[PDB]
Ligand binder design. Structure first.
Ligand SMILES: *C(=O)c1cc(-c2cccc3[nH]ncc23)cc(OC)c1OCC(=O)N(C)C
Ligand SMILES: *C(=O)c1cc(-c2cccc3[nH]ncc23)cc(OC)c1OCC(=O)N(C)C
Lengths: 306, 306
């Protein structure tokens, strides 16, 4: 028992991280088969980052202008292309450590692990949620661009995030591995509105079920509610509306705990209206929304990976 | 910027995890060079776990009674010995993935990453602190024994924890890699008092400095304090006494932020006496004590590992 914010084991991804240098900019790239993926703003100087014409800036570059280093070894770049906001550098060597992998575009509310990297070397790993407003609340310093977020299903790594920038508000923005930004952000240093962020209701309920499984249960009450009534409260507290799809994915947890989803919503309603009165749930004094229902079942059932 | 509970990259440790079977018990072992380390209670049946005589129970076992599996390959056991509460199985093959490593006994308040494993396969990674009472607040299910906690310094893995059991209170207990339990616990299924746990004061202060570095600063006040006065309050709130050694290790953070350690204690004093008034610090509504001062500098400076 016990419940922790648990990241995937990072070994499969560690073997894919390389360092990419262009001019005086160095950041991280992802080496899969014979292609290295990295943020296209690697080709930018500081004077270019206001309103960069990436097409024009990439034209001034040739294969030999991109230095790719995996550990202490050189890769040789034999082709380069831009896909949306990512650069794809073809190298002459397939990565011998390439895992089975897929590129996925995650939906808001879904979670993933982030391997924070500097100079092509792993620094640490943590679990993140894609916020409803398509930012992530990460931990990234200068040099971390090109760090990736991922999920693992047995032996297959699904890459879903590449880190591109920090907004002036201190939150983070990036792309999928096809180079499409999550949200409305662009890779230029301008003012960018993140937009109102809400709480991922289905994830809070998942965590409340996790709490019950683990012995934290003072918050269970003698009330129930309806989808519509609960959604009235959700709107008041800037929670995402609950749908029957969300109820359906909470099914397995309701079966495990014997607590109907709408009864757990009624507990959540009272917690929203009355607070926690200075108590805690799973070691937290606020409502946690970065565990999906799959995350809770995964952790509480001990699923492993190759 | 941003501050997250960050675990070490787990790849070096992933390559050391094996499955160990004895009788009908299967758990995790750590394969370093030609030795596999695992909890000695692998040799126990359920009827033995009340008052096991491990010496007598190990006498009934020979090398061929221990099945060690690394992935899908067999290791052959050519020697077995008991060191305190760990079994050391000599195998005929040195682990080709053995990292540079050391065995360390950590002190209370120090942190480490835990690679939770089942059947010799990694399930996830999270950051833990050794509580002052020598328990850890982990996430462990049946099958997780032999999962290990570790730190990494560049290319060297310092193993500090092997998971052995869950106490009836739901917290976790285990040994260093020489098999000495942390705390007063024993590997038998009996009643075991954890003892009063306190908050790791120096870690809370480290996190408050982390908050300031990251823009969370409403809690800075116009007061100061003295070691003795602050320690009066610490005692009242079940915080560990602050010593000049603790002040000294907070030096680098005070220099970075320009906030004297005793001024930060005065902020902590007011937070202890007045609470947070429904506000948050680094996304938390309670005072966090699982970041050491080194952890904060490590995360805020982007230290990497080979
Ligand atoms: C990419 O590595 C990168 C990183 C930053 C940056 C700075 C501070 C915090 C932070 N969090 N995520 C990213 C962060 C800034 C960069 O440039 C200013 C940057 O590299 C891009 C670059 O150097 N140019 C000129 C495009
Ligand atoms: C070791 O893998 C192990 C694990 C448990 C156990 C059960 C539930 C939660 C939990 N958290 N950490 C460890 C936990 C219980 C075991 O045996 C009852 C156990 O293996 C030891 C064993 O099977 N015997 C009989 C010694």
């Amino acid at each position: 028992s016990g419940f922790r914010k648990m990241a995937f084991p990072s070994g499969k991804v560690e073997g894919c991280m390389v360092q990419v240098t262009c001019g005086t900019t160095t950041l991280n790239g992802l080496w899969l088969d014979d292609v290295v993926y990295c943020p296209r703003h690697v080709i930018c100087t500081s004077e270019d980052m206001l309103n960069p014409n990436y097409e024009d800036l990439l034209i001034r570059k040739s294969n030999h202008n991109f230095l790719v280093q995996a550990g202490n070894v050189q890769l040789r770049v034999i082709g380069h292309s831009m896909q949306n906001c990512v650069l794809k550098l073809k190298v002459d060597t397939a990565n011998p450590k390439t895992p089975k992998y897929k590129f996925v575009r995650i939906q808001p509310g879904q979670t993933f692990s982030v391997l924070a990297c500097y100079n092509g070397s792993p620094s640490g790993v943590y679990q993140c949620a894609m916020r409803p407003n398509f930012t992530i609340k990460g931990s990234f310093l200068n040099g971390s661009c090109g760090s990736v977020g991922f999920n693992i299903d047995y032996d297959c790594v699904s890459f879903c995030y590449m880190h591109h920038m920090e907004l002036p508000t201190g939150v983070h923005a990036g792309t999928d591995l096809e180079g499409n930004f999550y949200g409305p952000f662009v890779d230029r240093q301008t003012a960018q509105a993140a937009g109102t962020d809400t709480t991922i209701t289905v994830n809070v309920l998942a965590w409340l079920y996790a709490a019950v499984i683990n012995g934290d249960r003072w918050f269970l009450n003698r009330f129930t509610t309806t989808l519509n009534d609960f959604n009235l409260v959700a709107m008041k507290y800037n929670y995402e509306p609950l749908t029957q799809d969300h109820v359906d994915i909470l099914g397995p947890l309701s079966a495990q705990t014997g607590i109907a989803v709408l009864d757990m919503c009624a507990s959540l309603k009272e917690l929203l209206q009355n607070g926690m009165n200075g108590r805690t749930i799973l070691g937290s004094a606020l409502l946690e929304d970065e565990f999906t229902p799959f995350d809770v079942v995964r952790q509480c059932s001990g699923v492993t990976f190759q």
